[PDB]
Paper text:
In order to advance understanding of the specificity of [name] enzymes, we herein solved X‐ray crystallographic structures of [name] enzyme Pro_7066 in the absence of substrate and in complex with laminarihexaose (G6). We have characterized two enzymes from this family, one from the microalga Euglena gracilis, and the other a bacterial enzyme from a metagenomic library, Pro_7066. Both enzymes were shown to have substrate specificity for β‐(1 → 3)‐gluco‐oligosaccharides. The domains present within each subunit can be defined as follows: an N‐terminal β‐sandwich (residues 1‐303, yellow), a helical linker region (residues 304‐341, lilac), an (α/α)6 catalytic domain (residues 342‐1045, green) and a C‐terminal jelly roll domain (residues 1046‐1156, red).
X‐ray crystallography was used to determine the structure of Pro_7066: the substrate‐free structure was solved to 2.05 Å resolution. However, useful data could only be obtained from the G6 co‐crystallization, the structure of which was solved to 2.25 Å resolution. Both structures belong to space group P212121 and contain two subunits per ASU. The two copies of the molecule in the ASU form a biologically relevant homodimer with an interfacial area of ∼4230 Å2 were calculated by jsPISA. The formation of a homodimer in the crystal structure is consistent with the gel filtration analysis, where Pro_7066 was eluted as a dimer. The architecture of the Pro_7066 active site is highly similar to that observed for [name] enzymes. Bicine (BCN) derived from the crystallization precipitant was bound via hydrogen bonding contacts with R470 and E951, possibly mimicking the interaction of the enzyme active site with the hydroxy groups on C3 and C6 of Glc1P donor. A sulfate molecule was observed (ice blue) occupying a similar position to the phosphate moiety of Glc1P in the PsLBP structure (magenta). Although the RMSD values suggest that these structures are not highly similar (RMSD > 1 Å), the structural elements neighboring the active site are relatively well conserved: (a) the gate (blue) described in PsLBP can be identified in Pro_7066, although in the latter it is part of a disordered loop; (b) the opposing (red) and the adjacent loops (brown), which are present in all of the three structures. In the Pro_7066 structure, Dom 2 (green) is found in proximity to the gate. The average B‐factor of Dom 2 (∼70 Å2) is higher than the average B‐factor of the protein subunit (48 Å2), suggesting Dom 2 is more dynamic compared to the rest of the subunit.
Residue numbers in the entry:
A (entry chain B): 89 to 409
B (entry chain A): 19 to 519, 523 to 1156
The structure:
Amino acid sequence: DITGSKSIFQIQYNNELIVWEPFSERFTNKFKITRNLYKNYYGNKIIFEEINEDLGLTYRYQWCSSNQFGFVRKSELSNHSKNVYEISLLDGIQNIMPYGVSSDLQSSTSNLVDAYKRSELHPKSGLGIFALSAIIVDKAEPSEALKANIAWSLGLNNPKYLVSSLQLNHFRNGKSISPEDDIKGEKGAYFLNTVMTLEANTQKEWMIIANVNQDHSDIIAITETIQNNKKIAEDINTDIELGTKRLIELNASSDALQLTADNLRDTRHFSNTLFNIMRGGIFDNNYQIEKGDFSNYIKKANKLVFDKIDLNALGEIFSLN
Amino acid sequence: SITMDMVSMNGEMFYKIANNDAMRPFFMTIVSDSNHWMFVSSNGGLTAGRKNAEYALFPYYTDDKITESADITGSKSIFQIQYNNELIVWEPFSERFTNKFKITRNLYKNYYGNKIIFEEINEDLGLTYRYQWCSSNQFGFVRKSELSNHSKNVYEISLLDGIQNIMPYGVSSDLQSSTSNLVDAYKRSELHPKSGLGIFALSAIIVDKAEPSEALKANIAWSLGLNNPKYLVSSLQLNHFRNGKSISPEDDIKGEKGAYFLNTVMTLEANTQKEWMIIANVNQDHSDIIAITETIQNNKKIAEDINTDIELGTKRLIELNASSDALQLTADNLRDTRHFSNTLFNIMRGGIFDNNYQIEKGDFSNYIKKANKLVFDKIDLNALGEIFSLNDLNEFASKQKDVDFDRLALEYLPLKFSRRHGDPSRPWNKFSINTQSEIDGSKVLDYEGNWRDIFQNWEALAHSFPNFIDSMIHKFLNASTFDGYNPYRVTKEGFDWETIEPWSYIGYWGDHQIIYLLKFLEFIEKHQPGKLHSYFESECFVYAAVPYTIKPYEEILNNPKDTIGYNHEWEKVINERKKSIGADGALLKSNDKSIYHVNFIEKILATVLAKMSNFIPEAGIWLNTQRPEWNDANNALVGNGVSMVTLYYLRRFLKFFDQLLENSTLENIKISNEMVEFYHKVRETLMENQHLLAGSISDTDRKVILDKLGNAAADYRFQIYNSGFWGKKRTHSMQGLKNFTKVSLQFIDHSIKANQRPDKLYHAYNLMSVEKNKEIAISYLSEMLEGQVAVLSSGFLSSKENLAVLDGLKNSALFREDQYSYLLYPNKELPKFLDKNTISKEAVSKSELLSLLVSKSNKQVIEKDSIGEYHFNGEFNNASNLKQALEDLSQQNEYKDLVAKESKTVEAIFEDVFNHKAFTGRSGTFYGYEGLGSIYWHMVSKLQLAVLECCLKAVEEKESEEVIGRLLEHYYEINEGIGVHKSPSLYGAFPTDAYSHTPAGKGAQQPGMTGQVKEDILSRFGELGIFVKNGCLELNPCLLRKDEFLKEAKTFDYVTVNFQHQSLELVEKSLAFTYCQIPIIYKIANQKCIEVFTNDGKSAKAASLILDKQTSQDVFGRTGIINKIEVSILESDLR
Ligand SMILES: [Cl-]
Ligand SMILES: [Cl-]
Ligand SMILES: [Cl-]
C-alpha cells in the first residue's frame, strides 16, 4: 500500500466523481474486480492487471529491465465499456530510496534517514531526483551525497508531478493536487497527474523509468535525451528486448531450449537451467579464453610462474586446446 | 474541524481531539506507575511490552514503521451488521473501506497520561465503537471495548474483535527487526479451551548453538464480557470475515503471526451499549498461566479485580508525581495538565525519592558494602533502626569520625522510577524500566543516567526535596576528575566512563561542569546560607579516576582534534582496586593513602583552572577534548571551535564564587602542593596581562596568554598522570583567591564585551586558528539561540541590555513565524542536487592534470557532462576520497608527475566547490532534530527560564515599569510559543505533552522525556512567585497573571507527605498548588497576608509573605508539621 506501484483514478460517470484504486485494499468490495498476474516464459517480465467490471476499465502495469535505463514500468489503461470517461489519474511509484543509504541503516533506523531526504523535480524534463542532503555517517566530518536515484516518464500530455506521497490521500478523497518540485524530510515518490478523455473501446499507454546510482553527468544525459531524442521510447523498448535476447543466449549455451508438446515442462527446464547458471556460472564463450583475463589470473595465482612463463606465443583469444 | 475539549468518559476526565484523522498521525508514550511501556500512534499503530523491548507484546520497530503497521498489528475490529436483508461490513479505524460511510474519529487521553481511547462514530448506522488501553501491574494491558447503538434501529451484529501480530515470548528485538520471516517458522499459537485464554509461544528459542533450546514462557491474551465467544489465534480468516463470511474456531496454529480474536453474535437494541475487555500480558510461565485459567473459571469478581488494579495504577502514579509537586489547580486545566506531565517526564528520567527523607537499613547497608569494603567492615550500623531519616544518618555519621563513610552517607540518594529515554522515535537509545525486582516484583532503588541529563533533571527534583541538595553536590563534585572533567554516566553504584572499541575515541564534554554545578551551588546557598562555607576546609571530597590522558599542550595546538588517549595501564590498576575495595577503587589515591581527600576550595579550583587554562581572550573556552557541548549536531566544531556559551556561564559561576568568598571569614585556603604552581601560573598570567584590557587584544598577545595558561595546565596534568598526588597540602591566602576570581572576571567581562554583534545578539561559538605559529586569529559563526540563552543567563548585562538582546532576537532570522518560536540557527537553502558540484571551465583549462584527464576520458577525479560542464567524481564524500583517487592516478606512468605537481591545486579546487572549511556538523546539512528549520524545544525553554530570571532582576532593581513590561511581554510571548494553547493541528499532538522538536515540515516529534520539562518546572515556580533566599521561603508572585485565578468553586484533590489522599474546597479568585508537597492556596484579597496551618490544629498569620527560617525549614524538611499555607495576594500585583 505504501511502497512501489500506486495508481488512483478519478472517473466522471453521470454527474458523479468515482474513485478507483486498483491493486489496493483501500476500497474493499466497492467494485466487482478481477485481478490477474502474468509472467513471461523467460521469467524477466511480470504484468499486474485489474479489471474493473463495473466500469469496463482495465489497468495493467508491467515491470521490465533495461541495462541502459534501469527499470521500466509500462502502463496501459483500457476502456472496453460503451461509455466515454473523463479521467483524472495519479500514477507512479512511492517510497523510492535515495542513493547512499546502507541496507542496515534503512532496516534499523528508517525514521532517522527521512530527516536527510530531499526529493526534487527537474522542471524542463519532468525527471525526479531522489537524494540525501548528506551521506549519513558517525564521523564529525563533511559527507557529500553526489549521486541519486531517479525516475522519469514518457507518454502523458502536460503532466503535473508529485515527488512525495504527501497529497496521495487528498486525491484518494476526490480532490485535485498541487505540483511539487522540492520536498524535504519525506519518503521519495514519483507521481504523474494528467486529465484525459478515454473514448469507448480505446487504450492509453505510458511508461515510467527508474534507475539507481546516478551522478550529475548521468542525470544531464537523461534530461538531454528527454528534450532532444524523438525516438527515446523506441530505444528503451529496444534495450528491453536486447535484455531478453542476451538472457536466452546465456541460458541456451547451457542447453536451456527444448520444444515438446508440453510448454510447462519446456518452461521449467528453461528456469531450472537459468537458476543453475545464476548460482554456478556459465562459460563466457564455448572453450574460448582471453589473454588479458588469463594473464591477470596467473599473476594472482603464482608470481614466480607469472614471471617465468612468456604468454606472447598465445593470441589475444585462444581455445582450451 | 479539529478541536480539543475536556470530556467525561465513564466518570473520568479526558482531553478529546475531535476528527483526529484529519491530522497527520502523531506518536505518544502512554505512561505507567509500573514497568509497562506503550508507544502508540494517533492512528492506533503501536508497540507495547513490559520492562524493555525483549518482552514486547507487539513488535518493537521505529516510529514510522509502527505508524505504518496499524492495519496488521495491534487492535482490529470488524462488524457484520444485518439491516434490511443486507449484510453490511464496518471496520472502524481501518483504511479498508474508504469513504464507504460518513464517520467521525475522536481520540482521548486522560489528564494523567496513562489511558487512551480510540473512538469511531459510524454516522450512517448510529453505531459508535470505542476501545481504551489501560495498564495493570497484576494483569498487564487491558483493552476495554464499548459498542454503542444510538440509532432507533435494532441490529443483528456478528463481531470479530481483538489484537493481532502478538509476539511470542523470547524473540530478541534484534532478531524480530532483521529476520521476522524466520521467526514465523517457530511460532505456535494455542487456545486453552476451558478458559478461552490464548498462548503465544515459540516451539524453541532461536539460537545458533547446536543444542536443545526449550521455550518455557509465553505471551497471553484472554477475555471477559462476551457470551459463548468463538476464538481465533491467528489472522488467517480475518479477510474471510471482512468479505461477510463466518469463521471456524482455531486452537492450534503453527508458523503464523499470533493473534487473539473473539467472535460473537448479539442483538443490539436501540439506545443500548455492549462492553467487553481483552487482557494481555508478557513473560508468563506455566504457573502464571494456570493461575489465570483458574481465575477465569472460579473468580466471579475477576472483572472488578482488573478494574481495581487499573485504578490502583493511577493512584500510585499520582502518589509518585505528587511527591514532586505535580498537582496544581488553576482556572486553566491545560496549564495544570502540562505541569503534571512535565513533572512526570522529569521523575521518569531522573527518578523520584522513595519516601520523603526516609532510608531503609538494608538498601543502605548493601550500598556501603558495594562502595567500600573497608568502610563496611569498620562501621557498625546497629544504632540505626530498620528505617531512619537523612537527619538520623547525618547524626550517626558525625559520630563515626570516618571521612569515607561521611562521603558515602552524604552521596546516598534513595531514588526509584528512573529509566533511560529510549523509544521508537529515539531508537538509538536502549531503554529498560527496571523498577520491579525480577525475583518478587518489589520496588528497586537504583538509578543511572548520562551526566547532563540526570543532573538537569535533579535541579527541578531538588526543589521538592531541598535537604537532598548536599547529596547531589557531593555526588557531582566527587565524580569529577582532578583535571576538571567527568565521566559520561552516573549510577547509584558510582560512575561509568566510555571505553574504546576504528575511528572511535573518548573525551570530555565542554559544558558538563560549570552551569550544571552552579545551579546546585545557587540552590544550597539560597536554602542553607553558610553551608558551602562549612565545606571550605573540610577534606571529605575525592577525585574520580577516569583513565583518560589529555595530551601535552604543544600536541593539542598542533592537532586539537587529537588530544585525549585511553590509558589502558591506568584502567588495569582501577579494576584491581575495584576488586580489592569496591566502587571507591575508582578514586585517586595519594603516595600516603588509598583514597586522596581534598576540600571544597580545591574542587572548585580544579574545575575553574581547567576552564581558564582553555581561555582564549575575546573568543571563549577552547573546545579541544574530543566531545562537543550541548548541541551534538555541531560536533565538528570540536578542534577549532571556541565556546562563548560556556564563558557566559563561567561569568555567572565566578561572580557567585566571588560573593561566596567575600562572605567567608576564613583567611587562608589549603590545596595540594601540586596545584600551587598551576594556580599561581594562571593567576600571574592574568595579573600581568590585565593592563591589556584597556583596549582590544592583538592576535600575538592572544597566543602569549593562551600558551602560558595551556602550558601551566599541561605541566600540572603531566605531573599527576606520571607521579600522582604525593599527599601534602599547602596553606595560601584567601585574599589571593579573591584576587584570582576578580581578575578572572575582568578577563571574562572584557571577552563578553568583544562578542556583541551589530544586531545586539551575542556570539555563541567562534573559530580559532594558529597563524605564523605566533598568533591566534578569531572568526565568527551564525547567530545561535544558545548564545542568547547563555548571555541572558550570565548576570553580566543590565536590564536594558537584556531587553535589547531580546528585541534583536525577536527581529532575527531565528524567529520561525508559523510556530512563533525560535530555531537554533538560521534556516538556509542548501544547494539543489544539480547545483552541488560544478567545476568552472576556467579552473579545468588552467589545470594541466584536469585538462589531460578530460582529454583521455578518465573519470576517476573529474568528468565532463554532455552539455560541457565539469563535475568531481560522484563517489567523493570529502577531500580524503579525492586524495585517495589522486594516489591511484599516481600509480599510472602518464599521471605520476602531474599528480605530484598539481595535487594541492586540485584539492584547492575541491575546497572551492564544496567549502568544507565552513562545515560545523550535520546541523547545517539535514532537515529534522537539531537541523534546518527545526525548533528544538529544550533550548526554547532554557530561553524562557533566562528571560524569567531577567524579569526578576528588573523587578528587584526597580527598573521603570516600561522596561519591566517589555521584558514580561517577551516572557509571555516565548511561553505562548512553547504551545500549550495551540490547536492540536498546529502543535501536531496533545499540546499538554512535551516533545523534543518540531521540524519545518511536520508537527511535534519524539514524545515525553525531553530535558525541556525541567526548565518549564522551574519557570512555573518562578511564575508562582516561589522564592528562597537567606534560608527563607517567600510566596510573593510578581509575574503571575490575573486570569490564572478560578472563576468558579473547584475541589483540589492532593496527596500529603504521608501519602494521605485529601481534598480542599477552592472558591472563586483563588488557585492551588503544592510545594515540598504542602498545599498552597493563593487568594485575591484587599491586604497581603500569609497564614500557616499546623498539624497541632493552630494557625499563624503575618502581613509579610516571607516566612522565617525555622518555618521554612519545616516546609523543606517534609516532617508533616505544616498542613497547608494560604497566601493573600493583591489584585494590583497580578499581571
Ligand atoms: Cl544506550
Ligand atoms: Cl539519561
Ligand atoms: Cl588524604
